[PDB]
Structure 1
Amino acid sequence: MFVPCGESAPDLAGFTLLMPAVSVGNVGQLAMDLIISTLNMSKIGYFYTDCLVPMVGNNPYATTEGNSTELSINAEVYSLPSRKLVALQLRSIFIKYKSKPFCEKLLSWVKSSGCARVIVLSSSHSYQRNDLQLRSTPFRYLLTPSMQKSVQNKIKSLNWEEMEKSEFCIRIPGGGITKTLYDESCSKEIQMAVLLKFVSEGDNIPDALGLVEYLNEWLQILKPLSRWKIPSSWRLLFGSGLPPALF
């Protein structure tokens, strides 16, 4: 379900939804935060669904004091009509048995709104990796059959590697929403590109930067080449300070 911040929902027809798929840490969510901060996308609404654990703070990307007093919630929707982009931002864990309901909700939402691509920024486990996977590269992708031939050939020309398939199944260890979301989108027959990076939990900011660069190789939403502006909220990412008695 989508709920606009104002009286009406601005149309997202001809757009491409950029998705944080909650996975191994927050690589996808951090990448989405990076993208929203850099492109300076304005919040358009709230994807108010009961699947995420509720939270409330202030606008993570606050650049002015006026923006610093803009209440935020777990699921907030941003858009940039200049590039025709939509940036949903999940900032919470999922609830038991609510991941697949969330996938269905979001895919119905994008089907109704008109967004063509639901490109997902996600992650998998840097372990449970084959010798080939360990040796080759962390970044992988996955294109649903409905994907247009043009962008599929663009990705092929970029020479990417696709997530290993294990008939087979679309398995993303530590993806959760990712795998089921892709399966349900394939059922819906709507386009999506599931970009992911093999990662281990911890300081994942470099991983988020790598994932947004991986996306940029394809979409070029940023000048291809500090370039990726970080949210002003990124701070104290290891808790409070250390006590005076110690050290």
Structure 2
Amino acid sequence: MFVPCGESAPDLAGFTLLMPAVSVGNVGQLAMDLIISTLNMSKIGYFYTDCLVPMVGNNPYATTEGNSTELSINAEVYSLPSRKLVALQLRSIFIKYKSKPFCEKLLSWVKSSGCARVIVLSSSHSYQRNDLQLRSTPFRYLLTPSMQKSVQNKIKSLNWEEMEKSEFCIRIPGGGITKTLYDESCSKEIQMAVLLKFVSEGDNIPDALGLVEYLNEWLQILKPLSASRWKIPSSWRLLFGSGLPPALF
């Protein structure tokens, strides 16, 4: 389920897993790309699996010339030992009846590695939103019962808004795999946190910036509150593609 880049097979005991749960508009993927680019996180392995559709291309974070010519895949995992953060990066879409196998594989991998506090950066639909949620902040958080109490008190001090679950079924209209991820994580009894935001489809870079700031409010991996806050990947060029034909204008 997890193949290291070489033969190192890094251990992730006591680390913190980060993933971009496939959101409405890949807001989680954009936020994870921002985090990886800002923290200069190197790929330690590949999360090769049948569930994610295949893709290839040059690494999003070209930076130098040598690093520019490195080939990336659909699911590459980056890690840096300084902050004890391991960041998985899904770069593709899911296949039908393939979310549950991926969730099971990821939960097994994180349990075996030893990492705790799986951060699930996701997003929900902004139109399947209640009036109270409409007038309130779009950001929501979800905590598993097994999650350590100290961080729960930290977030309570931060005064965040818990995701409204309705009897008490916790349904995320736009999470994608987030709901079943939460269910299976609760079944497996491992610490995990879900960070979502009510978004729509379109230009979602502001949504990704808001999500990374929301994550910062808890993790505090960067300064509290600016210019070049989060470094954007070099591959975020041409969000639309091609150019303007000359005949029209």
* Shift in Å, 1:193: 0.6
Q: 1: CA distance between counterparts of 2:151 and 2:202?
A: 33
Number of aligned residue pairs: 247
* Shift in Å, 1:167: 3.7
* Shift in Å, 1:8: 2.4
Q: 2: CA distance between counterparts of 1:37 and 1:172?
A: 28
* Shift in Å, 1:179: 0.6
Q: 2: CA distance between counterparts of 1:137 and 1:227?
A: 22
* Shift in Å, 1:30: 0.3
Q: Deviations over 1:50-92 (max 9, x none)?
A: 1001000011011011011100000000001100000000000
Q: Give the TM-score normalised by the residue count of structure 1.
A: 0.99
* Shift in Å, 1:239: 1.6
Corresponding residue for 1:42? 42
Q: 1: CA distance between counterparts of 2:12 and 2:209?
A: 26
Q: 1: CA distance between counterparts of 2:118 and 2:19?
A: 7
Q: Deviations over 1:76-123 (max 9, x none)?
A: 000011000000000000001001110010001000000111111000
* Shift in Å, 1:222: 1.1
Q: 2: CA distance between counterparts of 1:8 and 1:179?
A: 33
Q: Deviations over 1:114-148 (max 9, x none)?
A: 01111110000011111100000100000000111
Unaligned runs of 5+ in 1: none
Q: 2: CA distance between counterparts of 1:224 and 1:37?
A: 19
Within a 5 Å distance, the mapping from 1:4-153 to structure 2 comes to 4-153=4-153
Unaligned runs of 5+ in 2: none
Q: 2: CA distance between counterparts of 1:233 and 1:17?
A: 24
* Shift in Å, 1:16: 0.5
Superposition CA RMSD, Å: 0.7
Helix, strand or coil for the counterpart of 2:155? Answer: helix
Corresponding residue for 2:241? 239
Q: Deviations over 1:196-235 (max 9, x none)?
A: 0000010000000000000000001112212100101111
Helix, strand or coil for the counterpart of 1:107? Answer: helix
Q: 2: CA distance between counterparts of 1:185 and 1:106?
A: 10
Q: 2: CA distance between counterparts of 1:117 and 1:44?
A: 19
* Shift in Å, 1:176: 1.4
Helix, strand or coil for the counterpart of 1:142? Answer: strand
Q: Give structure 1 regions of 4+ aligned residues with deviation exceeding 2 angstroms.
A: none
Q: 2: CA distance between counterparts of 1:143 and 1:35?
A: 21
Within a 5 Å distance, the mapping from 1:223-238 to structure 2 comes to 223-225=223-225, 226-238=228-240
Quick one: percent identity of the two aligned structures? 100
Q: 2: CA distance between counterparts of 1:70 and 1:133?
A: 43
Q: 2: CA distance between counterparts of 1:176 and 1:169?
A: 15
